[PDB]
Design an enzyme around this catalytic site. Sequence first.
Site, short mmCIF file in Angstrom:
data_model
loop_
_atom_site.label_atom_id
_atom_site.label_comp_id
_atom_site.label_asym_id
_atom_site.label_seq_id
_atom_site.Cartn_x
_atom_site.Cartn_y
_atom_site.Cartn_z
N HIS A 87 -7.41 19.53 -0.51
CA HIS A 87 -6.31 18.87 0.26
C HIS A 87 -5.07 18.63 -0.56
O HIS A 87 -4.00 18.50 0.04
CB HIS A 87 -6.80 17.60 0.93
CG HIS A 87 -7.45 16.68 -0.01
ND1 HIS A 87 -8.83 16.66 -0.12
CD2 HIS A 87 -6.96 15.75 -0.86
CE1 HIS A 87 -9.17 15.76 -1.03
NE2 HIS A 87 -8.03 15.17 -1.47
N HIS B 46 -1.10 13.93 -8.70
CA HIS B 46 -1.10 14.89 -7.59
C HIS B 46 0.09 14.62 -6.71
O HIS B 46 0.81 13.65 -6.95
CB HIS B 46 -2.38 14.79 -6.77
CG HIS B 46 -2.54 13.44 -6.14
ND1 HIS B 46 -3.14 12.38 -6.79
CD2 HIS B 46 -2.09 12.94 -4.97
CE1 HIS B 46 -3.08 11.29 -6.03
NE2 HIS B 46 -2.40 11.61 -4.91
N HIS C 127 1.79 14.86 -2.46
CA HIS C 127 1.74 15.02 -1.00
C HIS C 127 3.04 15.68 -0.58
O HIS C 127 4.07 15.33 -1.14
CB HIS C 127 1.47 13.70 -0.27
CG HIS C 127 0.33 12.91 -0.80
ND1 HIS C 127 -0.90 12.91 -0.16
CD2 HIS C 127 0.24 12.14 -1.90
CE1 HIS C 127 -1.72 12.12 -0.89
NE2 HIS C 127 -1.06 11.65 -1.96
N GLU D 249 4.50 9.97 1.76
CA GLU D 249 3.57 9.00 2.37
C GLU D 249 4.27 7.66 2.55
O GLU D 249 4.42 7.22 3.68
CB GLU D 249 2.33 8.88 1.47
CG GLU D 249 1.53 10.16 1.47
CD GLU D 249 0.08 9.96 1.12
OE1 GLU D 249 -0.24 9.37 0.07
OE2 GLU D 249 -0.74 10.47 1.92
N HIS E 297 2.09 11.07 -7.10
CA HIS E 297 1.21 9.92 -7.40
C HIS E 297 0.59 10.12 -8.78
O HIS E 297 -0.21 11.04 -8.94
CB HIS E 297 0.10 9.80 -6.34
CG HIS E 297 0.64 9.39 -5.02
ND1 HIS E 297 -0.04 9.53 -3.82
CD2 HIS E 297 1.83 8.80 -4.75
CE1 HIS E 297 0.75 9.06 -2.87
NE2 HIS E 297 1.91 8.57 -3.38
N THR F 263 -4.68 6.40 -0.31
CA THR F 263 -4.14 6.96 0.95
C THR F 263 -5.03 8.08 1.48
O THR F 263 -4.71 8.57 2.55
CB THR F 263 -2.72 7.48 0.77
OG1 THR F 263 -2.75 8.64 -0.08
CG2 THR F 263 -1.81 6.39 0.22
N1 LIG Z 1 -3.12 9.24 -2.82
S1 LIG Z 1 -3.65 8.10 -3.82
O1 LIG Z 1 -3.86 6.85 -3.10
O2 LIG Z 1 -2.75 8.07 -4.94
C1 LIG Z 1 -5.21 8.56 -4.55
C2 LIG Z 1 -5.77 9.78 -4.24
C3 LIG Z 1 -6.83 10.32 -4.97
C4 LIG Z 1 -7.32 11.65 -4.60
N2 LIG Z 1 -7.25 12.10 -3.35
N3 LIG Z 1 -8.02 13.17 -3.45
N4 LIG Z 1 -8.51 13.38 -4.64
N5 LIG Z 1 -8.08 12.41 -5.41
C5 LIG Z 1 -7.35 9.61 -6.07
N6 LIG Z 1 -8.33 10.19 -6.90
C6 LIG Z 1 -8.65 9.73 -8.26
C7 LIG Z 1 -9.47 10.70 -9.05
C8 LIG Z 1 -9.61 12.06 -8.85
C9 LIG Z 1 -10.64 12.59 -9.68
C10 LIG Z 1 -11.21 11.67 -10.48
S2 LIG Z 1 -10.53 10.15 -10.26
C11 LIG Z 1 -6.85 8.34 -6.33
C12 LIG Z 1 -5.81 7.82 -5.58
CL1 LIG Z 1 -5.21 6.26 -6.00
ZN LIG Z 2 -1.79 10.44 -3.38
#
Ligand SMILES: NS(=O)(=O)c1cc(-c2nnn[nH]2)c(NCc2cccs2)cc1Cl
Ligand SMILES: [Zn+2]
Length: 258
Positions: A62, A92, A94, A104, A117, A196
Amino acid sequence: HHWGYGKHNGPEHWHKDFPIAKGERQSPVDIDTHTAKYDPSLKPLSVSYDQATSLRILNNGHAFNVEFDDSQDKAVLKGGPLDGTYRLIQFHFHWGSLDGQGSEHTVDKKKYAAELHLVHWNTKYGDFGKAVQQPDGLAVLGIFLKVGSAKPGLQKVVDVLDSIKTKGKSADFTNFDPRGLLPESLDYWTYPGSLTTPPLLECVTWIVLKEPISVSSEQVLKFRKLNFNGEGEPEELMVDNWRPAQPLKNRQIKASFK
Ligand SMILES: NS(=O)(=O)c1cc(-c2nnn[nH]2)c(NCc2cccs2)cc1Cl
Ligand SMILES: [Zn+2]
């Protein structure tokens, strides 16, 4: 029939598997600039990324994640609204199908083309998995992207995307310096919120920078050539992987600036 951003599994469906989707501190939100209060007590924000060790870039079906070595305090976020030390683990984005959508967070209902982010975890909880169970476990630094001039510090990311087109593909991604993604000013808004994406855990201190970065049309076009699908599956372009604004409920957004 897993969550995503399609017609049939998008954000309006997520509550069925993740009832916290309708919770009291969900993200993202609209930042009403006239209602956010300057909080002169906010300490200055400290972004210490000079020792950051990037390892790998992953298409997770995604978005794509740039992952860091977080086995010691190299790249850390401190200060601002934060108590203690938060370690960078990944960033990453969006983004949208068109330049007029993708972010977002919104600012006075304005949507930006994309949103970066930078995800950090609170080192008092010892590992990321324990931190996401805590109301102060994560800090996300959110940076808006608008389309105009190219961002030179983004091109190394744009140039590797061809190698991780489909879900589950990864590539070595060492020596990437995330300082090249920052704007000039660290003025910000901050509020308590959530992931999110499912599982939508209410564990995030959001820190959203006021100054957007500029990227070129060619740079964002390369994001939009990624795929949600795995290799050897029908092509579905990775676009519009954003959750819309959620109700603010009993929360205040604080500004670091007058
Ligand atoms: N959109 S967000 O609120 O910033 C958020 C999105 C993801 C995300 N979405 N899909 N994959 N990761 C995330 N993953 C953390 C880690 C990934 C792998 C090891 S730890 C953490 C946050 Cl806070
Ligand atoms: Zn994010």
